[PDB]
Structure 1
Amino acid sequence: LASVIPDVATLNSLFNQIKNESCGTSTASSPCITFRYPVDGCYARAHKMRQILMNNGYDCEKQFVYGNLKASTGTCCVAWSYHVAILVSYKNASGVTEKRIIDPSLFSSGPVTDTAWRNACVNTSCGSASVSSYANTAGNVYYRSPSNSYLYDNNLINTNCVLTKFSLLSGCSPSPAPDVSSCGF
């Protein structure tokens, strides 16, 4: 298991592998990743992206951002108290380590800097918005509270259950998302 991806070609491959699992595509396996439904389930999307990296022999970090968050899909807005995505480390063309967020719910075309990512979580086309804090964690953290408490989903039982519950959903409705209380760990 490697924390640093060896090159940009591999980072791009991994991005494509993640995008290929998006709900709405012919290419995805069960459960598809519900990037088109940004209302909720970010934690599950992130952990499923991490599973794809691990399938490939890589791990990553999570970045959690907290605040009065607002994001747009291009036709509707969602409001969040937190968001999470995977923060991938890789070696650039001269062997120096760089990091990028992968989050196709906000950036469908490729990896982006964490500063661009956090700014998309405070999108003022959806009204007032601000970041109160952000934190990086090991990838294995499923959720991090603003008080630095961790929860885990090591066998992806919660992840897969939530993704399945949200499988048919798209856009910014329904909001709140349907109940996922019955999904275990």
Structure 2
Amino acid sequence: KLKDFGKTVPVGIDEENGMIKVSFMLTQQFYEIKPTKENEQYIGMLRQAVKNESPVHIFLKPNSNEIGKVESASPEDVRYFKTILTKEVKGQTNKLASVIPDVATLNSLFNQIKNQSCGTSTASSPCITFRYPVDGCYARAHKMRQILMNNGYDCEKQFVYGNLKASTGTCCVAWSYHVAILVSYKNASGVTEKRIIDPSLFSSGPVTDTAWRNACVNTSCGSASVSSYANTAGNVYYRSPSNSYLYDNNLINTNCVLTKFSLLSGCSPSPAPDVSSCGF
């Protein structure tokens, strides 16, 4: 009767209103488990796995974000997850420009990125699923970076973590983390500044990282707060709270996730459809 969610690494466990909120690598979604006697071992398994950044096998109650069962990972699972969620740091091959020359160019890049939004006639496949903020921030950010790279630039990622909530203006989503591209550019006087580009939250243009993180703690949606943020090299697809990195060097996962979410919009479905079939 339970839905097989597959293997994953839990990265956070946080008590709220008599329920345990669990976060997992890569996905922005929170899962929940009730602190009942019958769940006490599943909860311990999750706590230890969070502590040690180790994988578990998750089963969900159907049509929900509620965990119904947790099973241990095999030695093979442990070995595999160590290979993909890694402390090994690998940089880009070619040397693109890390600093955009002026605001006009920054703005051009913004427009190119927004022109790739799903739901706009200018976009090519796979389009960037900005209109679907439920999940997939990681894929949207990696695709934004690819656009910069197509123009000869690289950038950073900024990952923000916490009890996050954001509004589209019509509905709210809850996230354990969010990511967008953090672009360096020279201002009018030649001094380097940084801005976030994230059309899923700011449709008008680049914004400060302070403003961007503030949009991730929108208290009109409910309780919200930031616990941490970290800037990384652009090539990092996902960064865990333990500072491990996951990569998607050829955008195999990115394009697969964007394709899966292409027709989705708004704050539903939630949780998002399964993207486990997407590999690297």
Counterparts of 2:114 and 2:160 in 1: how far apart (Å)?
22
Residues 49-82 of structure 1: CA deviation (Å, up to 9, x unaligned): 0000000000000000000000000000000000
Name the SS of the counterpart of 2:142 in structure 1: helix
Name the SS of the counterpart of 2:228 in structure 1: strand
**Unaligned 5+ residue runs, structure 2?**
1-95
Counterparts of 2:241 and 2:158 in 1: how far apart (Å)?
12
Q: Identify which of 200, 214, 219 aligns with 1:124.
A: 219
How far did 1:159 drift? 0.2
* TM-score normalised to structure 2 length: 0.66
Counterparts of 1:18 and 1:28 in 2: how far apart (Å)?
9
Counterparts of 1:67 and 1:12 in 2: how far apart (Å)?
30
Name the SS of the counterpart of 1:67 in structure 2: strand
Counterparts of 2:194 and 2:243 in 1: how far apart (Å)?
22
Residues 116-162 of structure 1: CA deviation (Å, up to 9, x unaligned): 00000000010010001000000000000011000000000000000
How far did 1:98 drift? 0.3
Name the SS of the counterpart of 2:110 in structure 1: helix
Counterparts of 2:213 and 2:133 in 1: how far apart (Å)?
15
User: How many pairs are equivalent?
Assistant: 185
Name the SS of the counterpart of 1:75 in structure 2: coil
Counterparts of 2:242 and 2:153 in 1: how far apart (Å)?
28
Residues 2-42 of structure 1: CA deviation (Å, up to 9, x unaligned): 00000001000000000000001000000000000000000
Q: Identify which of 75, 79, 90 aligns with 2:174.
A: 79
**Unaligned 5+ residue runs, structure 1?**
none
Counterparts of 2:208 and 2:247 in 1: how far apart (Å)?
25
Name the SS of the counterpart of 2:226 in structure 1: strand
* TM-score normalised to structure 1 length: 1.00
After superposing on structure 2, the runs of 4+ consecutive aligned residues of structure 1 that deviate more than 2 Å are none
How far did 1:182 drift? 0.5
Counterparts of 2:115 and 2:98 in 1: how far apart (Å)?
22
Counterparts of 1:52 and 1:141 in 2: how far apart (Å)?
16
How far did 1:102 drift? 0.1
How far did 1:168 drift? 0.2
Q: Identify which of 163, 168, 184 aligns with 1:89.
A: 184
Pick 1 or 2: higher relative contact order, CA cutoff 8 A, min separation 6.
Answer: 1
